[PDB]
């Protein structure tokens, strides 16, 4: 029993964190094999700023060891610093681009030193509600699938509302953001519906059934109600993905949707679900299955 916001073990990622300094700017880098990946704004027309830099302008520190940069190239908004030493702690890894609603762990770092790990989701507006201070740029987001680390995010900036923006490890931003000091605002956010349903199933698995009802709904009627409450449209794929949870609890996805529809139109009425007075949307259906089954890495 128990349901917590759980992050993946950060060990395979900690062994990759390095400190990158370029002039006055100091941020974090991801050292995988002989390449250190970091936000290209460490050089701060990026092509023009980068061509004026030489390898020895980039100081890379892996713990108490200085790595010597032997090359540099830019891929989108990520700078790839070729180093002389291959990281012996390089895990089995992939660079994956995630979709809004998908969750991941963030190993927040300052000066190439990991300080904390937390779990979060890519919001439908492509921002992440992270916890980042100055110096955290280059901190990465990841998932683990067996022994393989799937790097999915690299922190680049904080928006004026306190939310965060970043890229995949190929340097492509999530959302309509640019790595430039300019007027940028997060779009209106929506609740990740499939995740709220998954979290309601996690509540049922943990013995919290007060919100269940005898009603069901059509998928179209649910989406008409959901659109009004700034909830993401629930697709047939979302219904299919919730299938295993529906089978485990004996509650049809559209039956759980009628419970969610009632929670949206009526509130919780002084009650909580899994110790929460708000509907949680940062657990995917897979996170619920992985946690209420004990999958290991």
Ligand X SMILES: COCC[C@@]1(C(=O)Nc2cncc3ccccc23)CCNc2ccc(Cl)cc21
Q: Indicate which residues carry an active-site annotation.
A: 41, 137
Show the tokens assigned to 244: 């295993």
How big is the site for a copy of itself, counted in residues (CB under 8 A)?
A: 53
State yes or no: residue 136 binds ligand X (CB under 6 A).
Answer: yes
Nearer to a copy of itself, 210 or 215 (CB): 210
Structure tokens, 270: 């002084």
Gap between the Cα atoms of 110 and 21, Å rounded: 12
Q: Does residue number 264 form part of the binding site for a copy of itself (CB under 8 A)? A: no
10 Å CB burial of residue 56 (0-12, 13-18, 19+) is exposed
- Find the binding residues for a copy of itself in span 177-236 (CB under 8 A): 206-207
108 binds a copy of itself (CB under 8 A): yes
Q: How far is the CB of 170 from a copy of itself (least distance, A)?
A: 25
In whole angstroms, what separates CA 198 from the centre of its chain? 17
Residue with smaller CB distance to ligand X, 25 or 216 = 25
Q: Which of 32, 35, 137, 288 binds ligand X (CB under 6 A)?
A: 137
Residue pair 39/173 in contact (Cβ under 8 Å)? The answer is: no
Stretch binding a copy of itself (CB under 8 A), from 92-100, 210-218, 240-248, 289-297: 289-297
Please select the residue that binds ligand X; options are 134, 188, 266, 269, rule is CB under 6 A: 134
- Among 128, 164, 137, smallest CA distance to 37 is for 137
Nearest to 91 by CA among 111, 109, 107: 107
With CB under 8 A as the contact rule, the residue among 114, 141, 166, 175 that binds a copy of itself is: 114
* 222 SS3 class: helix
Q: Does 61 bind a copy of itself (CB under 8 A)?
A: no
Among 8, 106, 158, 222, binds ligand X (CB under 6 A): 158
**CA 128 and chain centroid, separation:** 7
Residue closer to a copy of itself, measured from CB, 194 or 202: 202
Any residues with CB less than 8 A from the CB of 108 and at least 6 apart, and which?
A: 114, 115, 116, 117, 118, 130, 131, 132, 136, 139
Phi, psi of 153 (to 5 degrees): -150, 150
Q: Residue 40, interface with ligand X (CB under 6 A)?
A: no
Segment contacting ligand X by CB under 6 A, of 151-159, 195-203, 248-256, 263-271: 151-159
Among ligand X, a copy of itself, none, the one that 220 touches (CB under a kind-dependent 5 to 8 A) is: none
Per DSSP, 236 falls in state H
Contacted by 179, from ligand X, a copy of itself, none: CB < 5 to 8 Å by type: ligand X
Q: Is 179 in the site for ligand X (CB under 6 A)?
A: yes
Is the Cβ–Cβ distance between 268 and 183 less than 8 Å? no
Footprint of a copy of itself on this chain (CB under 8 A)? 1-12, 14-15, 107-111, 113-120, 129-133, 135-136, 158, 162-164, 206-207, 272, 275-278, 290-297
């Amino acid at each position: 029993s128990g349901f917590r916001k759980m992050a993946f073990p950060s060990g395979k990622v900690e062994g990759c964190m390095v400190q990158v300094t370029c002039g006055t700017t100091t941020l974090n880098g991801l050292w995988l094999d002989d390449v250190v990946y970091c936000p290209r704004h460490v050089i701060c027309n990026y092509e023009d700023l980068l061509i004026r830099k030489s390898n020895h302008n980039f100081l890379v520190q892996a713990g108490n060891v200085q790595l010597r940069v032997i090359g540099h190239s830019m891929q989108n908004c990520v700078l790839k610093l070729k180093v002389d030493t291959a990281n012996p702690k390089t895990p089995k890894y992939k660079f994956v681009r995630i979709q809004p609603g998908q969750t991941f762990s963030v190993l927040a770092c300052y000066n190439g030193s990991p300080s904390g790990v937390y779990q979060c989701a890519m919001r439908p507006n492509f921002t992440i509600k992270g916890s980042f201070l100055n110096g955290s740029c280059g901190s990465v987001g990841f998932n683990i699938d067996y022994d393989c680390v799937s790097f999915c995010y690299m922190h680049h900036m904080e928006l004026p509302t306190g939310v965060h923006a970043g890229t995949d490890l190929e340097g492509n931003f999530y959302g309509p953001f640019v790595d430039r000091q300019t007027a940028q605002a997060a779009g209106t956010d929506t609740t990740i519906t499939v995740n709220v349903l998954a979290w309601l199933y996690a509540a049922v698995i943990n013995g919290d059934r007060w919100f269940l009802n005898r009603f069901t709904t059509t998928l179209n009627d649910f989406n008409l109600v959901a659109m009004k409450y700034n909830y993401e449209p629930l697709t047939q794929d979302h219904v299919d993905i919730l299938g295993p949870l529906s089978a485990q609890t004996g509650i049809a996805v559209l039956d759980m949707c009628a419970s969610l529809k009632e929670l949206l139109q009526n509130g919780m009425n002084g009650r909580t679900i899994l110790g929460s007075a708000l509907l949680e949307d940062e657990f995917t259906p897979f996170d619920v299955v992985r946690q209420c089954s004990g999958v290991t890495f």
